[PDB]
Amino acid sequence: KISAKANPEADDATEIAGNIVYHAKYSPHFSPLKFGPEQALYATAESLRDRLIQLWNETYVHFNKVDPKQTYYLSMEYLQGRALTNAIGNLNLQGPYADALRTLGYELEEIAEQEKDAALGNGGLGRLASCFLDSMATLNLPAWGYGLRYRHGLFKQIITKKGQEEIPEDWLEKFSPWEIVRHDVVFPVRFFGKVQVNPDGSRKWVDGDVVQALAYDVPIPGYGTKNTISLRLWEAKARAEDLDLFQFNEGEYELAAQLHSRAQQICTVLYPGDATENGKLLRLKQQFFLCSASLQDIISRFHERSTTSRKWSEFPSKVAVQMNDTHPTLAIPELMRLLMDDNGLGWDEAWDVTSKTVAYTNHTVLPEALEKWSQSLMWKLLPRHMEIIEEIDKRFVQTIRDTRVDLEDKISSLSILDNNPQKPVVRMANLCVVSSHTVNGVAQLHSDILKAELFADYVSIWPNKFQNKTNGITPRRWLRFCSPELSDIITKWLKTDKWITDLDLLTGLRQFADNEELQSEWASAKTANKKRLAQYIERVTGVSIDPTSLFDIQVKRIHEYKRQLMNILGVVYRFKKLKEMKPEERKKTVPRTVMIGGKAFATYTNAKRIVKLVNDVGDVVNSDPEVNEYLKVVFVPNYNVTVAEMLIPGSELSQHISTAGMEASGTSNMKFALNGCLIIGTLDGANVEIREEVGEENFFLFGATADQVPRLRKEREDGLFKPDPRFEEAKQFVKSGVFGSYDYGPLLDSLEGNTGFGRGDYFLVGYDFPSYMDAQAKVDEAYKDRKGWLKMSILSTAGSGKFSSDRTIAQYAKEIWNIEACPVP
Amino acid sequence: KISAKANPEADDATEIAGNIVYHAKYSPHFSPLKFGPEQALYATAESLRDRLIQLWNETYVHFNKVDPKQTYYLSMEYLQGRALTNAIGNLNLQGPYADALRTLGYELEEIAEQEKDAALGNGGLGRLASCFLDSMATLNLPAWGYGLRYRHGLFKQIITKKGQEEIPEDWLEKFSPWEIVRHDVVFPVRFFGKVQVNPDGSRKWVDGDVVQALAYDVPIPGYGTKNTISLRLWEAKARAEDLDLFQFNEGEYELAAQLHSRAQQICTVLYPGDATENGKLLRLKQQFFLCSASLQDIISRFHERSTTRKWSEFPSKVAVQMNDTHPTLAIPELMRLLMDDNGLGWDEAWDVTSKTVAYTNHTVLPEALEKWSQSLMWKLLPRHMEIIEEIDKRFVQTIRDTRVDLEDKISSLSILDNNPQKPVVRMANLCVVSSHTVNGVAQLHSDILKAELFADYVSIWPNKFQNKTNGITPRRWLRFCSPELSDIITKWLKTDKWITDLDLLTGLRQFADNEELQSEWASAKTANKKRLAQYIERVTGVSIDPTSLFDIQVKRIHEYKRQLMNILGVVYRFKKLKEMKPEERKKTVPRTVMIGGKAFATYTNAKRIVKLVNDVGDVVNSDPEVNEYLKVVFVPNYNVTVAEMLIPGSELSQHISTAGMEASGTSNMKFALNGCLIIGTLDGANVEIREEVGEENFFLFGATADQVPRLRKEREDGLFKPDPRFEEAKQFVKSGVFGSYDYGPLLDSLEGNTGFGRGDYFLVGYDFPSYMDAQAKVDEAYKDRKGWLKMSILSTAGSGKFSSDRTIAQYAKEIWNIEACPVP
Numbered sequence A: 001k002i003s004a005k006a007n008p009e010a011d012d013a014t015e016i017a018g019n020i021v022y023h024a025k026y027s028p029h030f031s032p033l034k035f036g037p038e039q040a041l042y043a044t045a046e047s048l049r050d051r052l053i054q055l056w057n058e059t060y061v062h063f064n065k066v067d068p069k070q071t072y073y074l075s076m077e078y079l080q081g082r083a084l085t086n087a088i089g090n091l092n093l094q095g096p097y098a099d100a101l102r103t104l105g106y107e108l109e110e111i112a113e114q115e116k117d118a119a120l121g122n123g124g125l126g127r128l129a130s131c132f133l134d135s136m137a138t139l140n141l142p143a144w145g146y147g148l149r150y151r152h153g154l155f156k157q158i159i160t161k162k163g164q165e166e167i168p169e170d171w172l173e174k175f176s177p178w179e180i181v182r183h184d185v186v187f188p189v190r191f192f193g194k195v196q197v198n199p200d201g202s203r204k205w206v207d208g209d210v211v212q213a214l215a216y217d218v219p220i221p222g223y224g225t226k227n228t229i230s231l232r233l234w235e236a237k238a239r240a241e242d243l244d245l246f247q248f249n250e251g252e253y254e255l256a257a258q259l260h261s262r263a264q265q266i267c268t269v270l271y272p273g274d275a276t277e278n279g280k281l282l283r284l285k286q287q288f289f290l291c292s293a294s295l296q297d298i299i300s301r302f303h304e305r306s307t308t309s310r311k312w313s314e315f316p317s318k319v320a321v322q323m324n325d326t327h328p329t330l331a332i333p334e335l336m337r338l339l340m341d342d343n344g345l346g347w348d349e350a351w352d353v354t355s356k357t358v359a360y361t362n363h364t365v366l367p368e369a370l371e372k373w374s375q376s377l378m379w380k381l382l383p384r385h386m387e388i389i390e391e392i393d394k395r396f397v398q399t400i401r402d403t404r405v406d407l408e409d410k411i412s413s414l415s416i417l418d419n420n421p422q423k424p425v426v427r428m429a430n431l432c433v434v435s436s437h438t439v440n441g442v443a444q445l446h447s448d449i450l451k452a453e454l455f456a457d458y459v460s461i462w463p464n465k466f467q468n469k470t471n472g473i474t475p476r477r478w479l480r481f482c483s484p485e486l487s488d489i490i491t492k493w494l495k496t497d498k499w500i501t502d503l504d505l506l507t508g509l510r511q512f513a514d515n516e517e518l519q520s521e522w523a524s525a526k527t528a529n530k531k532r533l534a535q536y537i538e539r540v541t542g543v544s545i546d547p548t549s550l551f552d553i554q555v556k557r558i559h560e561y562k563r564q565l566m567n568i569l570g571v572v573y574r575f576k577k578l579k580e581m582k583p584e585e586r587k588k589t590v591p592r593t594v595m596i597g598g599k600a601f602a603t604y605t606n607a608k609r610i611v612k613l614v615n616d617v618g619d620v621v622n623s624d625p626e627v628n629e630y631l632k633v634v635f636v637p638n639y640n641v642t643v644a645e646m647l648i649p650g651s652e653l654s655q656h657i658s659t660a661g662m663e664a665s666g667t668s669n670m671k672f673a674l675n676g677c678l679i680i681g682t683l684d685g686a687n688v689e690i691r692e693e694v695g696e697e698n699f700f701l702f703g704a705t706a707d708q709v710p711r712l713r714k715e716r717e718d719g720l721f722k723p724d725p726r727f728e729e730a731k732q733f734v735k736s737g738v739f740g741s742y743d744y745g746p747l748l749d750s751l752e753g754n755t756g757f758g759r760g761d762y763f764l765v766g767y768d769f770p771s772y773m774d775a776q777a778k779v780d781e782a783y784k785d786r787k788g789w790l791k792m793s794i795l796s797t798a799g800s801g802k803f804s805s806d807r808t809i810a811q812y813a814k815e816i817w818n819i820e821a822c823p824v825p
Numbered sequence B: 001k002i003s004a005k006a007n008p009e010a011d012d013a014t015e016i017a018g019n020i021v022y023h024a025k026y027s028p029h030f031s032p033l034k035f036g037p038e039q040a041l042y043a044t045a046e047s048l049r050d051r052l053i054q055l056w057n058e059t060y061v062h063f064n065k066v067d068p069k070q071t072y073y074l075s076m077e078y079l080q081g082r083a084l085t086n087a088i089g090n091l092n093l094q095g096p097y098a099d100a101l102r103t104l105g106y107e108l109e110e111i112a113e114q115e116k117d118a119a120l121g122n123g124g125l126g127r128l129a130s131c132f133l134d135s136m137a138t139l140n141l142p143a144w145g146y147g148l149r150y151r152h153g154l155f156k157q158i159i160t161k162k163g164q165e166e167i168p169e170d171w172l173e174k175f176s177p178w179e180i181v182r183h184d185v186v187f188p189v190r191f192f193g194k195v196q197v198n199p200d201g202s203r204k205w206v207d208g209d210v211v212q213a214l215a216y217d218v219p220i221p222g223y224g225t226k227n228t229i230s231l232r233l234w235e236a237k238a239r240a241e242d243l244d245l246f247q248f249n250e251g252e253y254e255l256a257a258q259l260h261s262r263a264q265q266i267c268t269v270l271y272p273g274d275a276t277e278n279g280k281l282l283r284l285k286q287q288f289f290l291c292s293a294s295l296q297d298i299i300s301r302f303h304e305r306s307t308t309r310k311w312s313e314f315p316s317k318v319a320v321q322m323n324d325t326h327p328t329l330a331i332p333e334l335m336r337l338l339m340d341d342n343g344l345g346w347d348e349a350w351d352v353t354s355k356t357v358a359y360t361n362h363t364v365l366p367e368a369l370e371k372w373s374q375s376l377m378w379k380l381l382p383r384h385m386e387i388i389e390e391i392d393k394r395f396v397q398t399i400r401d402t403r404v405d406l407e408d409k410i411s412s413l414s415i416l417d418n419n420p421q422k423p424v425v426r427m428a429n430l431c432v433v434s435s436h437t438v439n440g441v442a443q444l445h446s447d448i449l450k451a452e453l454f455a456d457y458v459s460i461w462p463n464k465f466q467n468k469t470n471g472i473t474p475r476r477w478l479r480f481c482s483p484e485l486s487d488i489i490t491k492w493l494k495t496d497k498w499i500t501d502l503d504l505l506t507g508l509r510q511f512a513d514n515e516e517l518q519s520e521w522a523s524a525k526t527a528n529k530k531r532l533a534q535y536i537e538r539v540t541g542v543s544i545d546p547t548s549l550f551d552i553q554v555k556r557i558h559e560y561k562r563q564l565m566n567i568l569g570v571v572y573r574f575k576k577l578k579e580m581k582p583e584e585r586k587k588t589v590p591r592t593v594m595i596g597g598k599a600f601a602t603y604t605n606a607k608r609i610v611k612l613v614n615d616v617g618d619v620v621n622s623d624p625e626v627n628e629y630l631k632v633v634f635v636p637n638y639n640v641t642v643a644e645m646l647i648p649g650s651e652l653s654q655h656i657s658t659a660g661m662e663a664s665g666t667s668n669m670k671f672a673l674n675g676c677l678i679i680g681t682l683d684g685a686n687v688e689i690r691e692e693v694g695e696e697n698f699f700l701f702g703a704t705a706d707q708v709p710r711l712r713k714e715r716e717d718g719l720f721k722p723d724p725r726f727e728e729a730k731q732f733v734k735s736g737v738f739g740s741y742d743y744g745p746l747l748d749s750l751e752g753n754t755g756f757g758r759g760d761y762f763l764v765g766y767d768f769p770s771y772m773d774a775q776a777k778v779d780e781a782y783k784d785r786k787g788w789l790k791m792s793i794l795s796t797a798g799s800g801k802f803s804s805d806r807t808i809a810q811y812a813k814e815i816w817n818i819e820a821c822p823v824p
């Protein structure tokens, strides 16, 4: 009944419904007869894209005219998630789009579930970049992100009898309705080759392989603003002419298409396995490709904004480049190359530009994690860059000899090049610190450790280089849009919706935390979210969960330091206790549904064993009629932004239980706190700040602290460790065969012995187990006291304002980038 | 200045311009600032696509409701060309689109030149399929074409100083604005594997590789009708899940992506080189992929039209036409789908298959008919080999039961050739045995099929063999490529109804001596020649004189096509001009010779011939003594667009293949339709063209087909007496006048009396004197302007028979038994 009527500016239900039908008919991607939920998704996304194109174009023109200083964020990951709800929400068209879809015979949630997550990232590094983009838009800042257009993500996780299996993501196998290809925005990127030296001393990288970098824009709308910025993604392509017809017609198909193959490899997956030389080279190719394409584009834009060609001295006053971790380190020597070789600048001029343009964000505690590459591999793949890095290092060392002779003895550790006789490498973090005008960590304690310990000598050389910028999360995706009913309650009680862009207003809830009407609304909202989560879990796992039970969630990368193993051993203990109780005693317990999710790196044997263990435990627990009214255990598969958007709103307790000292941050922790989920956790990462903000009384702390961990490991080494019998009992119960034929002995050996690699319980699972189980008992007692629990939940949201990514990005803008709002009129 | 305003039904200049600006903004594929001619092309194409989607949808719905018998044309090639002018033309929106683009600051010609030809074919076989689609639409017939969505065509031809170089086509490297992907229309296609025998006795093809066939529609609009049919093209794809992450993460990238690689190979190029086993297998994969995907889709559509269906209805509702033997596997594939997937018994399945499928043959030489190793067929398509063996077993039994007189010919009539050295499957035999109808493509060709090639099959099935003379669409090939000439025709016939009733062109005959018509005719040709001269200068750098006789030869470069004869005649003409006193040169007819065509990359002498033409041109065109009287240009990258530029400006075209070697000749028909006279042998479509236009309006020369064997024997026996002009031309090439390239090796092909690659098998020497004498007749005729213009008018006037509308009407009535289904 609704006829096709194009209206790219559609802003009421009738206009929008017409525009959707228009796209279904005139932007077809399927046979015309059926308009199923899939077709409806694409046509709805296309209708929204019309609004986004108008705004993206206006923002591009405005920034071009104003010629502001502009930030470019380089990241190897973006966890964009699904775009639909966010687009609708930022445009403030929820009502009109819901009504439009209803007139076409669909509920918006049916359609939203058809959208595949954009598989452009893996973990928190990527989700940080994605929150930052939302905040850049909303704060009206002239800032873009650049990334790679990965076709297959990291992997889609499936759970079989074997445990985790890894399959390629398929988000682009039909098409993405959000992106906009820019066929005119193509830049050449070279690999391998050699350096031509001209008679005048100029140098030019030549030969090797050349791939084409093709731009795709993903519009990022801001909340309550026209400003719509870009995540510009690069696809690596060979040219049609790079196919060798002679070889193809000789039947040598692989040889014929070898450049196409090498191009496709770049954007196949995130973090391609690098145990082999081929894989190391591919990782470096991906990093270089991102850096080179992006910087070429940035330079082109700098010039196109000229009104006269413009002075290079203006460049660092008009461009900021932020490196998210060390992955984009090659931006340093690449910008040098582009300035000196392609644009003729002398070294000193080029260095002044580069050093004032680039800043570095570090995310880590362990020096062992910081990227290093073989000098031989770098010479092979990127010879001109190795020449430039050698000169950076030569000049840096000379600075020490000229100005800081007291540090002469530390040249070997401070240099970018490690000339170890066996394994010479380039220390990428050293290159970043030496070259960047600013270095920042991602939480106060993390940033303090970077200054005091990891990079102390560099701090001595450059006393103002190092900063802190505490991470944050966007309260659009992570509260307003994922939990709209709770959001409406917040708005009602605060008497304003301005908290959506001024998150510290949430503190206005504190005065009402004992208000029984608010507690009742809060409980009702959580209940509706729990019911939705239970529906989701049943659909994706087949397990029916009881929404009156305590929902206890641990979702993050599977790793020994994250201690999913501790959680599951506690579950095994709780199960064994329940089995041993008489029914009268079981009725005294707090019923609980334990949900654990996350991905294991495919070659990480114990992480895969842990996924297998969680599933095997669940299979037994969930099917035992004697305890399954009190305990169920589910492994939630394929954790990604969409899964997070389902879990977080329905969560009551979340676990952030990593060995103390091993986490720099913890943005998921923030998301949970913001949504009224209480935390059981170690004094570690973002838990420190969350506990400070929400109050110690509204958090369940346990475990060794960071400063104790070395003593405790030494006590274990010295034979002084006294394991709690409940821990031994849990381990032995896993080893008893109760969970089936799989032998968990090898996994649990990691907890045995007193010393040795892969042994001796390095992550203190045994040591922390008793205080962990005691904190879980406190959780149970707290959960029985409903009024008390709801007060804690309200106070958790109420104290969450500091964690806004708007606060984070405003700080980067003022203190690092020196950019300011540029609102599109 | 002009505001974006969507209107998918735009039919006036203002509405159209708004819609173009709307697509430029809201269907972007580039940065938004610049609206250059490329961006304008895509936005204009998208505007037209809106009109085409409406009509394609209406046609699909109407055919679904009516449930007519529907034809499906299977072809390994389609030469679609550029779509823009044809779309505008068939929608009758020329004025409104021209005006709309002008308001946006462009002439339609600037935009039309930005469009890349759809590189979906190579030669006449493919252009025939494409003309047929246009006629199917225009005649309101329920008929589709299926094909492969080739990414890189055959090759784009580049001319360097070294001669031809071959590079992949790039028409899809950005995107094609015409096509419509159908992500729901995906069928699995298997390769390799084995035949499972089920407990009940049924059989199932299992294991091996499975690729996904994804459909894209290319709407084909009809002239003066809403009817808009499809060219449905298949892309071979692997699934994301077919990438092996373990291998990829181990750095074994080729292994990890091997299924993706094998899928991509299917649609990389036309006619992938097959000197190796790999290449033979890839050719068979392509053919099977086309057949299997298309048949699965056809069967799906047959069922979807059910209102409540019986398999007995299938041959009453489906016709499948095989364009050459490339789609031969449609026969055993339909059998497999019917018997295995749908449970039919052999006899029922065979009745359906044999009544559904018909075969069009295009070949003179039996050596050209496709044969495949039995071993390769078993390896790639084991279930199909089981089926082919049973077809053959039953056929041979029919001979033994009903035609005992042919028992001694079973070895040559069987589909399987069990020659102990090289056992093969004879695909043409499988096609003739299985198809209810077989046709050739010209009367003489069809007569030869019946009398010689397939005489015994004709004896077995006296009504199976037919003729359907080829044709060309007078939309693309007259109305749209030559609008000014078309307006003259309309004026003089007092109607434009000839555009769909081409025999009305005979009404020009009465005016062929008319001084006013001759004047308008000459003016139109002159304007086309000036446009061609502009084009030639742009693409070759050579300035040509539009007052000279434009002499064109464009087709595949091959020894049997005799470009070598043409260029030797040019060399001779050049030498004579150089030797003449200026007073004698002023008595000659100035001529510009244009030669174009592609050489298969491994075909050494064909590449040498391209090199020769360019080398001769380099010398002739820069010689100030003679270049006012003769130039010779190699026109690069011959394709539909090049034909659209050359044909309208042509005055003489050469169709000079050794007699007996051409079945047809559709380009010949295009030239005749545009008033271009032919110098040619009595061969292929020249025979019919000469009949229709009159012998006095055609320049015939050369041996006839029946003489060729005698002439080759005379050469073998040492009795050949070469004309001194031929020897003089050859020696001049060998003299080094055309530079450092040694043409000795090429010309050795013309030397000796016997042996493969020697002895002038294609009779270049023998036919040279009559060819040169015919060229002298051309010159004398060209000096008599009134006489020439009369011939030109009579050529167009007699061209009606060559309409593809006539051809397709005949297939529809005599083979397919389908009829008009006009969309209201």
Ligand SMILES: *Cc1c(COP(=O)(O)O)cnc(C)c1O
Binding pocket: A079, A122, A123, A124, A125, A127, A555, A556, A557, A639, A640, A641, A642, A644, A665, A666, A667, A668, A669, A671
């Ligand atoms: C927020 C989020 C993260 C954050 O990572 P952690 O470091 O685990 O706190 C990771 N993945 C997803 C899908 C997220 O939404």
Ligand SMILES: *Cc1c(COP(=O)(O)O)cnc(C)c1O
Binding pocket: B079, B122, B123, B124, B125, B127, B554, B555, B556, B638, B639, B640, B641, B643, B664, B665, B666, B667, B668, B670
């Ligand atoms: C018409 C046409 C042909 C026809 O081929 P013949 O050479 O006459 O067999 C081939 N190529 C193109 C581009 C055509 O337009």
